[PDB]
Every structure is written in structure tokens, then in C-alpha cells.
């Protein structure tokens, strides 16, 4: 039906800032909610009506935006791993994108 494009397998330096961006193309489905998650950790939620929400565990190291993207500030070596952008849409359903970060 549709596809998610990512920024790809990104590489960054310790102490810096990076941008995690996703885009859902080849569909006109109403994007109700965007979830920025890890394997078993929720980073941030972007609701179409309720707005942004940042997890308290990432409240001081994550910045909302650009658009439906995430900005990781003051990068540590522990920040290395898979990042997921889960797009909750109507009527298509649930789309998922994966980004691997290396610090």
C-alpha cells in the first residue's frame, strides 16, 4: 500500500546532536499518531490533536521536531542501537520504520 523512508543507518560523535526523521509516502492515510520507540522503551509520541509527549527518562536529552521527527541532544555511547518510527494511520493501519544509530 504505502512505505516509510528513513534517514538510514546514521553515525554520530559523543556529546553532539542528531536528527531522527521518518516519512510515510505512497499513501494518503490520516496520520493519527507517530511513536518514536526502541526495543522495549518509548522515547516520544506525536499525536495529531494532543500534540507532543516526551518520556521522563528522555525529557532532558530529546527535543521534539523537525515535523514528525526526533532530535537527540548530548549523545552518549549508550545511545547506540535500533530506533523505530511507528506510524498509526487510518485507514491503512500501522507502518513501521527502523533506524540504527552508532556512537
Amino acid at each position: 500500500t504505502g512505505t516509510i523512508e528513513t534517514t538510514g543507518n546514521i553515525s554520530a560523535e559523543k556529546g553532539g546532536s542528531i536528527i531522527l526523521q521518518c516519512h510515510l509516502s505512497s499513501t494518503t492515510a490520516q496520520v493519527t499518531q507517530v511513536n518514536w520507540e526502541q526495543q522495549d522503551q518509548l522515547l516520544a509520541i506525536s499525536n495529531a490533536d494532543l500534540g507532543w509527549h516526551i518520556s521522563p527518562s528522555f525529557k532532558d536529552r530529546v527535543a521534539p521536531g523537525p515535523g514528525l521527527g526526533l532530535t537527540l541532544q548530548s549523545l552518549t555511547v549508550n545511545d547506540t542501537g535500533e530506533y523505530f518510527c511507528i506510524y498509526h494511520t487510518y485507514p491503512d493501519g500501522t507502518y513501521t520504520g527502523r533506524i540504527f544509530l552508532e556512537v
Binding site: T32, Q33, N35, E37, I45, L50, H88, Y90, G93
Partner: protein, 127 residues
């Protein structure tokens, strides 16, 4: 805090109508269910999302199999008045051998995030 109550296994006769229960518990004030999605984790990419429910738009069935003709939301209601998506129980009319498998019910909520529950559908065979 919030959890998904689903039956581990649901058994049903071939041709009959079966119910796949999915409930979001407990009711938390301030928590908004943005979307409800039924997915088959075994099925291919273009056949993952079998059913979906929006609080404003209502129900939708993206996958042509089982499609809108054989699927329906038992208690899920849209807003016209506030919406009730707490009860995500799905009905499967005219059960076939292809319907046997795993069914994941997912709740897209704010600000708790995503919460899911999985159910195995056992299609019983006669003779």
C-alpha cells in the same frame, strides 16, 4: 498501568461466527485511545493490517483477506457525543481454514503509548 486483556486461544467451527475479545483495562482518565488495530503477524506485509478503528472515522479493513465482508467490530463505537474504543472485540463471520493463526490487537494511546495483546485462532475441522 494500562494493559490489554485477550484470550490466549479462541476455538471456532468451520463456517461459523467467532469473537476475538480485546479489552483495554483499567479505564484511566486522561488517557485517549487514538487508534485500534488488528494485525496478523504471520501474514505478508500487504496483509498485516486486517482491521482498524478510528474514534472519529470509525471502522476500516485494509487487507482484502478476510476483508470487510467477513470482519466487524462487536462493541467499538465512533463519536458523533464521545467515542468508545475500550472494547476492540472483533467478529469473524464465515470461518475458513486460512483464518487459523495469530491475531495481534494493538491500542495506540496517549500518553501511555502502544499496548498490544495476541490471540491464536483455532479453526476446528469436522469431517
Amino acid at each position: 498501568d494500562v494493559r490489554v486483556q485477550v484470550l490466549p486461544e479462541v476455538r471456532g467451527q468451520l463456517g461459523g461466527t467467532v469473537e476475538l475479545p480485546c479489552h483495554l483495562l483499567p479505564p484511566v482518565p486522561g488517557l485517549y485511545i487514538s487508534l485500534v488495530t488488528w494485525q496478523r503477524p504471520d501474514a505478508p506485509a500487504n496483509h498485516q493490517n486486517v482491521a482498524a478503528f478510528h474514534p472519529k472515522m470509525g471502522p476500516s479493513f485494509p487487507s482484502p483477506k478476510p476483508g470487510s465482508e467477513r470482519l466487524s467490530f462487536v462493541s467499538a463505537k465512533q463519536s458523533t457525543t464521545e467515542a468508545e474504543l475500550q472494547d476492540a472485540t472483533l467478529a469473524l463471520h464465515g470461518l475458513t481454514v486460512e483464518d487459523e493463526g495469530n491475531y495481534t490487537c494493538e491500542f495506540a494511546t496517549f500518553p501511555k503509548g502502544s499496548v498490544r495483546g495476541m490471540t491464536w485462532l483455532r479453526v476446528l475441522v469436522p469431517r
